Design a protein around this ligand. Sequence first.
Ligand SMILES: Nc1ncnc2c1ncn2[C@@H]1O[C@H](COP(=O)(O)OP(=O)(O)O)[C@@H](O)[C@H]1O
Ligand SMILES: Nc1ncnc2c1ncn2[C@@H]1O[C@H](COP(=O)(O)OP(=O)(O)O)[C@@H](O)[C@H]1O
Lengths: 705, 181
Amino acid sequence: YLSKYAIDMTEQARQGKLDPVIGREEEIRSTIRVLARRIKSNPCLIGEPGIGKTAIIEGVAQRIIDDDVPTILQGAKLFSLDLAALTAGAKYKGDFEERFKGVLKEIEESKTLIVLFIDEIHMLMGNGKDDAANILKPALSRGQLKVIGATTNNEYRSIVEKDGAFERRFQKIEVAEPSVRQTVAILRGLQPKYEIHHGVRILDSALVTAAQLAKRYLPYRRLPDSALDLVDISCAGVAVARDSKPEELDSKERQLQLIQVEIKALERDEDADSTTKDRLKLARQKEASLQEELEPLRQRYNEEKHGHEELTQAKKKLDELENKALDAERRYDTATAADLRYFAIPDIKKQIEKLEDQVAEEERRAGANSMIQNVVDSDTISETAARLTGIPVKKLSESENEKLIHMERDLSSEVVGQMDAIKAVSNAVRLSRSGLANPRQPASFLFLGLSGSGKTELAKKVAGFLFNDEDMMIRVDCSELSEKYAVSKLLGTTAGYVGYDEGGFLTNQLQYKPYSVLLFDEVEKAHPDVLTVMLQMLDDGRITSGQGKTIDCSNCIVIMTSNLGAEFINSQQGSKIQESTKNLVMGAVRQHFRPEFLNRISSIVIFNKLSRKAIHKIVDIRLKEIEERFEQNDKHYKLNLTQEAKDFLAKYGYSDDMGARPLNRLIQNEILNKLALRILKNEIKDKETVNVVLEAEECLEVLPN
Amino acid sequence: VRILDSALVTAAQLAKRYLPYRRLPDSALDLVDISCAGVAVARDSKPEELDSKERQLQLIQVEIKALERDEDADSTTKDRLKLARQKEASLQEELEPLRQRYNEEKHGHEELTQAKKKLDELENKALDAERRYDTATAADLRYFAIPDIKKQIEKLEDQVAEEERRAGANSMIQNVVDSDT
Ligand SMILES: Nc1ncnc2c1ncn2[C@@H]1O[C@H](COP(=O)(O)OP(=O)(O)O)[C@@H](O)[C@H]1O
Ligand SMILES: Nc1ncnc2c1ncn2[C@@H]1O[C@H](COP(=O)(O)OP(=O)(O)O)[C@@H](O)[C@H]1O
């Protein structure tokens, strides 16, 4: 009774009822190719989920369906296999065997050409193996019973290593996440299914932005479904608003009720017969306007909706007319194709065109309909992504280039001085951007200078700037990168030893944050063995863990920080780094890192000493930022440090060893302490006044309370 | 898929040369099996050349029929389907010979397939007979049985025929080319 679980996908394809397959034509051919092999003919689709593996299998079916497959496979019937067949359909330890043997018998003995498939090949075997199909199939594997499997490459590798024997039967086919442009084409191919499902028009630019967004917004989900997820969700958003619309409709009915109350109050009161408030007639104009407007808002919006419903159904009609016309062509019924395919042409073109004309236009805009009822690229999808990811405007405004154009400017606002560091970074970043750099390796930098210099701050600010999120940064505790390196580190414990869920700190965090910066805290303290590990992974971003699991990085900016040249910067020969001083640094770097390492760094950057000139600005800046990030609209500060607190901060706070590190702490301590005190006075309600009253910091600033 | 002999020569060379860890007796076959499949796929609808032209034919056939029955089917806008039909037919006239050459040769190919298998079966059984000194059984499997299969093979190979350009003068090679494919 395999027929109770197995799904004859070939038949479903004969009936359509499947999404079209876009962009995998070669994978399909490859699959077919493998199936066509006389010996090695059991392919697997190996790679990530959400990228059309099913579609490929179905694509094969579709070619079988349309006689676009060599005879050997042309007559084949493709069946989805499932856990349910052996588990749900068994519920006893050995009934898994019986259910599978059922399949093997029924299939081996009938209909000549049958292909089975498992979209979860790892599922077979399972933990403990238990001959969960996995041996029985080899037992009869010479007896045709062609089958295609599939899994995440990382697991595939593990499966090969775990089982071995199926390797002699199965042909992995590498599949991969499609490009953005391919994705858009896919989205376009699937667009009508959403159009129809939701009854929402989709802008072509919207599809484009969905893909663009998936690449920075849903960075760990696979692009094609992810973009589709954005589409589906976005469409749902629109549809929900569309079929409800209470914000305008209910608010305005409530506004009518309120103006009616005002009018009656004005009509019968002491001032009703006076000059005072003789503007009552205008309230009546509002009431009358609403009395006439409100039902038309409900009806007009529904008229817009109806235009979109009819439009949707016209588009649906086309999909259906073609699904049947094309099936007629498939079945060689050229008479129906001549009639039906034909009718579809002016039917849908004239119907849809005029239904689009119902949406119409106004003198000031295309689309007279005010409820939009479509997916608007950024207004809908990017907005949706923002609803899924945060910081709407900066995310909405992303354009690559505007950031790159003003990047150093903006960064110099965040980071004071060391503009050359900023420019250096910006430049390398610009090369990473626009694809000028070789894509195998992201820009990467070695930040040299003292604690409190901003090396890390900047790197975070850059992440801030580039990803609109400073906390994208992944930190690496380099001094802990000992000769024992593996377990809590990117490599992770080698598979086969206890730990599979390894290196989450870096492998997974990076998986979740590809669009980030990886930063090495005092990289010179890393053990040399580890340095070679990161080196191979420094460039050649295609990182693979000790579990054999590929991480795959490219984009991630990599920044190393170092105090190695601290002695040279400690010369304090002005702020700006001087000749010789910098060379001593280079020397030390060359001693510590093999040039091979260094050669992979896009740039080695030496930060200047911030000195007093920078902190004159930094303390002002940080103080303001502290307020701004600290609170929103219940605390409103003057933050006027006056020259005296600025000087105190510079004099006692700023350190030539610890840089701004103590400035931050100091500012926070003293301001927060004064703030808390006056808050406790509770004679304190809103706005602000600040001031200064005259060992280290004996003045203690002292603001009014 | 018939394959030019030099292919095999090159396959083994290529396998050793480029399929690092795979062993020759099997990896060479992997190139064969894969490339055979390559061709088997490439040929799609019977031999190569034909497939592509059939795809043109079918796209044309549909266009013509859609054009045939339309609001403006009688306008030269759509009536151009008659010229499209000349193309459909012209393709059909090339496609048929490609199909027929492939198919009749295929038939011969299958007859060769079976004949050779049958030849081996007769000899296997005849050997069983001779090792037992059973000349009667060996004779039953050698007199007529064997002359029949051998002559079928010779006739079939001649009908298939071969050219310097290809191991199959008609179409069942799908133009597979040693090193190129
Ligand atoms: N071009 C495409 N055509 C149809 N589906 C696609 C395409 N590209 C990606 N997909 C998606 O891949 C999914 C099915 O394949 P896949 O995700 O790899 O299988 P699985 O369901 O195991 O994840 C579908 O949800 C489908 O939307
Ligand atoms: N605007 C700024 N310009 C330069 N440095 C800054 C600025 N603001 C803060 N910093 C300091 O840089 C430090 C973080 O970077 P870094 O000096 O490398 O720190 P750490 O040595 O702890 O890793 C913080 O202590 C921070 O106060």
